Design a protein around this ligand. Structure first.
Ligand SMILES: OC[C@H]1O[C@H](O[C@H]2[C@H](O)[C@@H](O)[C@@H](O)O[C@@H]2CO)[C@H](O)[C@@H](O)[C@@H]1O
Ligand SMILES: OC[C@H]1O[C@H](O[C@H]2[C@H](O)[C@@H](O)[C@@H](O)O[C@@H]2CO)[C@H](O)[C@@H](O)[C@@H]1O
Ligand SMILES: OC[C@H]1O[C@H](O[C@H]2[C@H](O)[C@@H](O)[C@@H](O)O[C@@H]2CO)[C@H](O)[C@@H](O)[C@@H]1O
Lengths: 400, 401, 400
């Protein structure tokens, strides 16, 4: 059950949810309809579970890559923007939320990873990944490190993997070929090998996550990090004088980050579809709406032409757009769940030394494609559950 | 039941005329000295493949033809080789229903299709459309009655509504089924199931209603209509209800499309009595006298035997049965039908009970019906069930300390 | 994990590991590099688990059928022999270790099963399988038996199954069709049915394994066995006067043994790749090298042309090559593991009487052409683990 006459919206905890809530306050002030903004953990996984039961938020925010899966699973309502409203947003952002001929979400903003560097610590950032090892050695002598970024989410290491030729699904003849996966070719192998070598050579730690990497950079312990626009706000609050720039090259090739369009989908089971449309079209996707969210945590290059004309003047947004141009807009196909899970497992296993880069990537190629009932994620969850049950069994055998 | 030589053990579903079939068995025993045992175990369609795979089970198994391609593919059925003269006694289309990869793998017995069964005293003019059923129920509720009750636990009964406006199992093209093209989640399938769920949401039907409850309600004059096959008419006759058998209601102006079954008799690949089974089936069951004995117990539908069917076809209930069959389709017999049926069974039950939305339930069913295999939906369900049970046992055990 | 400046080699326990170590000793005297030969149990399964973690031997020996799987999994280095060396080996043996255009191992020897018979007990061996039951009935009256061979490994029963039409994967239109499996056709079924009838009629025991059959033949208790060239050494040391000959026919058709090419692969994670190449090319694959291995346990028909010209004069080798010519060289494709596991399970289940031949083979056809993550083997392991956990629960409930 979803309460009628109210809007519940879910958005990730790294985004400007407090700003989104202000927009909700304006909506409530004009209409009397309460808006509740929440940022639950494991959002992208939680939504498909509750939505399938007819429960969950009225509106779900995530990058566009998950939306095809949601739509295929019967979880999203088709959105019906009139022509005039569709002209307010960039066409390519609409393309990102089109699934099987139908618009399945409202595009909000374009996200791409950039290299973020400490200006005082490193006035001239490296153009290549190759020179990072020597840079780190010099900084260790000063009690610092070259680079820390999230190694637990494949999103962040993907630009290096794609740099020299790695790809997700081959786009051929108007479609993605789910039988043609590129996570195990020579370029992908070379990219991940470099990451793993950085860790082998004590220039990076395999255990480093989002939180640890952010804290190290914002406290001035590391000279560089890799992140998107949402992260700039916390860096501002800290004392670090930072620049946002083009990602380093690898083997002479640009890093190719996967570009995301933060998007707003409407729960198929919502009894407030028309309120959701009004909130999204008449309140959020306006100059005042996006500004409020942006002021909280920066959105990137927004989908709304009128407000983007302002943000484009920002050099950090230019760097963001340069990096996006060098990458590719993510597919939204249902198979993106398997791809992301496969690559997540490979990077983590290779980085920790449990699998070689080659073994890990060969397995990722297999898992990214395809099947359904017994996916890699499912087998892993089962094996974890069995281990947990075994543990309980031993503690019970002990008390017997 | 490690299949004794020199005896016949027969399995048939409990809704069928097993007592009548036993009379045929008795006649067989008097002529040949070979004892025939007819049994009707619960869940036989699932029990047969399990026990037959070990060389156990009945010599002869009765079920609608849709399960038989799977049985045959799994190596459980003997190939049937009737002489030309015998094969000519049965309609060719009924033989098509039991032909798998060029081989006959059962004897066809009878054609089954669902019809709308209505109480003439309670409802002299039955509804032509599903759409007018809510208002009909509203009138009948005021008299302490209801419009319609039928088995909502078996997707067989709900499939006619789902298929009405465009739902399908596997796409038929160029002479074969494309098992990668499943149609349980298109606009028509979704519209049909949504209508059913809306019937439940608006309290015109109850999600818990099963076969025995719907039958009792109709035969007691408590509900104006039910949906059932010919095997059901016998108990209605016995109840004395003034009933008619008629065309299913339309949905969105389109006929309901029941999946039609051909009741069939297969021979266990492991039976050491294959010749006795053949003789029983050809020279005893598939005669005018044989089928009549079964039919007198529970009606078979339109039988496969030409000579006996020319007599039955004159019955208006059989004409209605054939009209509904023509509006539906004879089921595929391909191995993938068990996955299809299980997928739809889960979807209908989950949506009717409110556990899943109609759209989520059918989208997963579309996925599950096309599951290549080794890890099927059913196996996944059984695994999850087994784990929760073990978790439950541990919770009770930790509690005891 | 893998020591640099040293070589560790793994080879199966039935092969001439002592003889290979002698080659290892010769390598060490000339180069100063220590060579360690090991024969761990369950080598074919143990290698991919340890190699995937960057551990294991530098060199792995096994028949070529598993190598495509090892290579697909990213466990094998491409070998770089160069033209002149390749000319020393038969072209068809190079074909056996070529995977997706690359050489992924060095071929060593061609192995095929033969009929091995006691000349004193049975001076004229049966030409057909059909005449074996009557032979056993005659021999049992003398306190002996006609035939015992390993019934636990599908390798040994495969020749009978393939005789009348059974096949693994159809080689059609230039490639193996993993969707066209032939273990459930009329020929496969007729072949397995005959085997099961032998057992039902007490001419054989379903539990008979490699060790039991070998001991039975070498103690003069059974008149015939089925084995490869490796087994002759132990027979020589026994008192049995034996002959090696063409396998019996079935329904007028030759038995079709699956032919293996014993091969040496190089662990992708090895830091001694150059040492391994020099070892394999300049020490093992020479006349003295192979002869040293051969004297310990016979290799069969070797891949090195110069030494085979010698071995070919041996009538036992002529028999081996006659049977090999009547069979087919195994595919090396990754799918061969599902195939072997599928068939292993079918033969055992049918032979034991737990399933009918038709049910077991029909299920094998399905398993051999599996998907990806949920293989038959995984399911079996899952079921095994559940049964154990269930047993523990009953044992705890028993304690009250
Ligand atoms: O790491 C895999 C993950 O990458 C992307 O998620 C991003 C998201 O797009 C950003 O807005 C930000 O929150 O970082 C996330 C990574 O932690 C994909 O959108 C997501 O589907 C995928 O699983
Ligand atoms: O509900 C799924 C079920 O439908 C059919 O079973 C019918 C059967 O054909 C009729 O003779 C009668 O007994 O009712 C059954 C439904 O309860 C399919 O034949 C069967 O395979 C399928 O599971
Ligand atoms: O039995 C299945 C098994 O057969 C082959 O293994 C052979 C091997 O090739 C021989 O060299 C010798 O050691 O006997 C083995 C049988 O026990 C296949 O090569 C192997 O992949 C397969 O599992």
């Amino acid at each position: 059950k979803i309460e009628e006459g109210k809007l519940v919206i879910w958005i990730n905890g790294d985004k400007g949810y407090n700003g989104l809530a202000e927009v909700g306050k304006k909506f409530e002030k004009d209409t009397g309809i309460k808006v509740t903004v929440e940022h639950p953990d494991k959002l992208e996984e939680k939504f498909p579970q509750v939505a399938a039961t007819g429960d969950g938020p009225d509106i779900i925010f995530w990058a566009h890559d998950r939306f095809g899966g949601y739509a295929q699973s019967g979880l999203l309502a088709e959105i019906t923007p009139a022509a005039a409203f569709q002209d307010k947003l960039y066409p390519f952002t609409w393309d990102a939320v089109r699934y099987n001929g139908k618009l399945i979400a409202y595009p909000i903003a374009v996200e791409a990873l950039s290299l973020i560097y400490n200006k005082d610590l490193l006035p001239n950032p490296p153009k290549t990944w190759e020179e990072i090892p020597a840079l780190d050695k010099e900084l260790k002598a000063k009690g610092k490190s070259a680079l820390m970024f999230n190694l637990q989410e494949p999103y962040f290491t993907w630009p290096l993997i794609a740099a020299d030729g790695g790809y997700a699904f081959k786009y051929a003849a108007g479609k993605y070929d789910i039988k043609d996966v590129g996570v195990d070719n020579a370029g992908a192998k070379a990219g991940l090998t470099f990451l793993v070598d950085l860790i082998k050579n004590k220039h990076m730690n395999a255990d480093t996550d989002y939180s640890i990497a952010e804290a190290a950079f914002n406290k001035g312990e590391t000279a560089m990090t890799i992140n998107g626009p949402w992260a700039w706000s916390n860096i501002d609050t800290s004392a670090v004088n930072y620049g946002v720039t083009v990602l380093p090259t690898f083997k002479g090739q640009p890093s190719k980050p996967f570009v995301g369009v933060l998007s707003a989908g409407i729960n198929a089971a919502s009894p407030n579809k028309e309120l959701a449309k009004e909130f999204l079209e008449n309140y959020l996707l306006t100059d005042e709406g996006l500004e409020a969210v942006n002021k909280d945590k920066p959105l990137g290059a927004v989908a709304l032409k009128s407000y983007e004309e302002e943000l484009a003047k920002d050099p950090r947004i230019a760097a963001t757009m340069e990096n996006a141009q060098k990458g590719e807009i993510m597919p939204n196909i249902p198979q993106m769940s398997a791809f992301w899970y496969a690559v997540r497992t490979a990077v983590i296993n290779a980085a920790s030394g449990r699998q070689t880069v080659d073994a890990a990537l060969a397995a990722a190629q297999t898992n990214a494609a395809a099947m359904g009932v017994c996916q890699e994620k499912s087998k892993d969850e089962l094996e974890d559950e069995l281990r947990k049950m075994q543990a309980q069994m031993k503690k019970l055998q002990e008390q017997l």
